[PDB]
């Protein structure tokens, strides 16, 4: 996936403003609320029984932070997403057995969370750039499946 130089600058600038303590947990939590069958992968995380329980679950927040950190790693290596995510791709396939369609769902949930957090500033051109990013991350995470 190819971001223009203007798109790269816009994605980098917005990402610097992200609340790294909250955005990842909000994306993971919304995935588990909006697509509740995805809770299958997180049975060990405890109480996922209501939207409030999901979003306030400390394990959802903590894991979401790790997910966000991996997204940050991708944003720092936009010309090599496949190499950035190869180890996590093997992990999600061989160890965790996660259908990569879920990476698409999570990417679009993250876009919704960015729109929620940034309001007006999440303009249609900024969204289009982030759609390229989340698709590229999903493709890279799916790449080592076999």
């Amino acid at each position: 996936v190819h971001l223009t130089p203007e798109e790269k600058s816009a994605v980098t600038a917005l990402w610097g403003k992200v609340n790294v303590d909250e955005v990842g947990g909000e994306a993971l939590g919304r995935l588990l609320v909006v697509y509740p069958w995805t809770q299958r992968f997180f049975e060990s995380f405890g109480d996922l029984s209501t939207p409030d329980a999901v979003m306030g679950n400390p394990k959802v927040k903590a894991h979401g932070k790790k997910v966000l950190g991996a997204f940050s790693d991708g944003l720092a290596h936009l010309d090599n997403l496949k190499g950035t995510f190869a180890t996590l791709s093997e992990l999600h396939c061989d160890k965790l057995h996660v259908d990569p369609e879920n990476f698409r769902l999570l990417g679009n949930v993250l876009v919704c969370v960015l729109a929620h957090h940034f309001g007006k500033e999440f303009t249609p051109p900024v969204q289009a750039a982030y759609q390229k990013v989340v698709a590229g991350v999903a493709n890279a995470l799916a790449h080592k499946y076999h």
Binding site: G29, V33, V54, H116, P124
Partner: protein, 141 residues
């Protein structure tokens, strides 16, 4: 199916959209054309530039149909029956595209109505938009 809570959530969120419905529909279309350029293949006769009068007019058509669907949430197949006829016989938009606009409508609502866009309401809105999309393509074959 849409639960009683889903219907309550959708009516509240779309009620708050209110008179902004057409403007938000136009923004959702613009987001979709920029993010998912293949959707532009259905509008070769449109000026798709930012602030386009044709995009604004189409946004109003989309939004007004959604307002009607919300007002008839208990029986959307009947309320949308003429529209689904027209889709199956003329417009014939591939089903994949409705998911793209639905996502862009969620983004638009999240960016505009942060107090309304809770996780539960997000879930209900996504179900509602998927149900509308299902009705629109229900007569395709």
């Amino acid at each position: 199916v849409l639960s009683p809570a889903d219907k309550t959530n959708v009516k509240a969120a779309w009620g708050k959209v209110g008179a902004h419905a057409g403007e938000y529909g136009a923004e959702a279309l613009e987001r979709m054309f920029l993010s998912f350029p293949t959707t532009k293949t259905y509008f070769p006769h449109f000026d798709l530039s930012h602030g386009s009068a044709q995009v604004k007019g189409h946004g109003k058509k989309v939004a007004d149909a959604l307002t009607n669907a919300v007002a008839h949430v208990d029986d959307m197949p009947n309320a949308l029956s003429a529209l689904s006829d027209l889709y199956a016989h003329k417009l014939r938009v591939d089903p994949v595209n409705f998911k793209l606009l639905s996502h862009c409508l969620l983004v638009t609502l999240a960016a505009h109505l942060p107090a309304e866009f809770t996780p539960a309401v997000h879930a209900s809105l996504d179900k509602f938009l998927a149900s509308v999309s299902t009705v629109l393509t229900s007569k395709y074959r």
